[PDB]
Amino acid sequence: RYEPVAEIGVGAYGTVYKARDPHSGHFVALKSVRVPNGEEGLPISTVREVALLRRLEAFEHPNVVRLMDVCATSRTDREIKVTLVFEHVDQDLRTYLDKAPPPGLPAETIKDLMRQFLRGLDFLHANCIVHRDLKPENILVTSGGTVKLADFGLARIYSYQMATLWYRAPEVLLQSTYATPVDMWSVGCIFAEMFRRKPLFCGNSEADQLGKIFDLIGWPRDVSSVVPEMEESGAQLLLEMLTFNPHKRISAFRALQHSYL
């Protein structure tokens, strides 16, 4: 059994409490998801998607949180509650950036967090995984300097129970793409927030959210510059990220090998 003793908060994926692993001692992040108890028991999608994520642990990739256990519970004739047990970082990004010595830099903290960040992001993409909901609430960082991506692929789990526009790429929700480049956009959005320490193109409905973007950046439609806080190559790159067309757009792998080192 696990026992809770905090709450990282109310996230896109519900309440994320916090417990201890009795014998192991370590801290654990507990999430949950309600799924339908059909006549075929555990819904296929849930068994499969969940298991695809436990599998990932096999790689031991440091820039990604470890789903350590999973436990289903509720057995009402019509619902099941699946408890996701994760690896716990104490401080996420948002808290970790505030802290930072004004003006909140240098770069050999950013440059290397943008590196750790892009690694865990290419890995996922290697395993045919998209994050789609990439946030600094997520991007946890250990009291040791290791960034560890946060709540991946869970979009396809929470489809039931679900039934912040701050970071979504132009593809969403203008359509619903759920492509892989969607993460390369929200990298540029988080990329800047490292500097300014908060969201360019944040707030409001898809209209404004997507309107705000055509301010800077300029398939089409029918409605309505750089402004950099220190680097050129960081702009040369962050604009390759924040390209409109996802096809002619940067890759987490490409990115990691850009002159920006």
Partner: protein, 237 residues
Amino acid sequence: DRVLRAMLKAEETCAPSVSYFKCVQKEVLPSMRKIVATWMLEVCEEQKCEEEVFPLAMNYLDRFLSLEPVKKSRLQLLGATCMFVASKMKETIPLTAEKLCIYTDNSIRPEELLQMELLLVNKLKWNLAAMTPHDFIEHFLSKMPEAEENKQIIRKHAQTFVALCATDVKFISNPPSMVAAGSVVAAVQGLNLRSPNNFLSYYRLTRFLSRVIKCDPDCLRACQEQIEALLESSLRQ
């Protein structure tokens, strides 16, 4: 050369105990595990299942028996549940709980099955995407000097051998990579032994696949011997 490290890791995470009969189990004996395994096998064949379904199921069944005492009377219900979950993991059209029960002559009920499923998956910590020997056969196959024609024949024979090992205690001792090696080796030998010009990958394949696996080629020859003997008992049937 790279993603195999991960298959070798995963495989090790989902490893059953070779001592579960003595240390965990009280009612259940090997003889029964075989009765159930070969039942499971005949269901998969009858139903034209994806080839990976059976071995994965037995993976579940050995890993669960390694953590839970089961009553010899609930054993067929555990086989059934393992096929149910394996099928969900490897099939476009998974088996229905109703159709599994039909193969038990309805001695169980979808409700029993669905209860087990939650047990089995929870005891396995939802670690269901396990490595079967088929994952390796295909890895091995892709590093081998063989025309596709030969590759598909070797693949048929090895899958035979694998199924055969699954109904047998071998499967508990040897990890899927071993099981797949010995099988490929056995397959490719016998095939070349019949057609000496052909199937030339037979040559030093044991050592070659040990290189791939990173292990001792003695075990692989030991493991292989076992498969070939175990196949000698399979004519009898």
